[PDB]
Amino acid sequence: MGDGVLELVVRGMTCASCVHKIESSLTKHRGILYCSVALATNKAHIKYDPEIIGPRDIIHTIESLGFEASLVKIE
């Protein structure tokens, strides 16, 4: 409920694959509330609370997995 939206533009990606890699991966952090990786806009719309997980924590994990990841925040 009004927790924290987090559009990371994920510079990299391709088609599928990278998508569910991100989604499946970061959802393992029990502070990610949701992970919509809009390939269409090369963007992880993550939903998270800042309290139990920092945005950088997720970002590190994303960039590490395949990418560069920048919290544009609704782009």
Curated annotation (Swiss-Prot):
Compartmental location: Golgi apparatus, trans-Golgi network membrane; Cell membrane; Melanosome membrane; Early endosome membrane
Result of changing K73R: In MNK; loss of protein expression
Tissue expression per record: Widely expressed including in heart, brain, lung, muscle, kidney, pancreas, and to a lesser extent placenta. Expressed in fibroblasts, aortic smooth muscle cells, aortic endothelial cells and umbilical vein endothelial cells (at protein level).
Positions bound to Cu(+) 6: C15, C18
HMA domain span: 4-70
Signal peptide (from-to): none
Role, per record: ATP-driven copper (Cu(+)) ion pump that plays an important role in intracellular copper ion homeostasis. Within a catalytic cycle, acquires Cu(+) ion from donor protein on the cytoplasmic side of the membrane and delivers it to acceptor protein on the lumenal side. The transfer of Cu(+) ion across the membrane is coupled to ATP hydrolysis and is associated with a transient phosphorylation that shifts the pump conformation from inward-facing to outward-facing state.
Family: Belongs to the cation transport ATPase (P-type) (TC 3.A.3) family. Type IB subfamily.
Illness: Menkes disease: An X-linked recessive disorder of copper metabolism characterized by generalized copper deficiency. MNKD results in progressive neurodegeneration and connective-tissue disturbances: focal cerebral and cerebellar degeneration, early growth retardation, peculiar hair, hypopigmentation, cutis laxa, vascular complications and death in early childhood. The clinical features result from the dysfunction of several copper-dependent enzymes. A mild form of the disease has been described, in which cerebellar ataxia and moderate developmental delay predominate.
Protein known as: Copper-transporting ATPase 1
Residues included from the entire protein: 562 to 633 of 1500
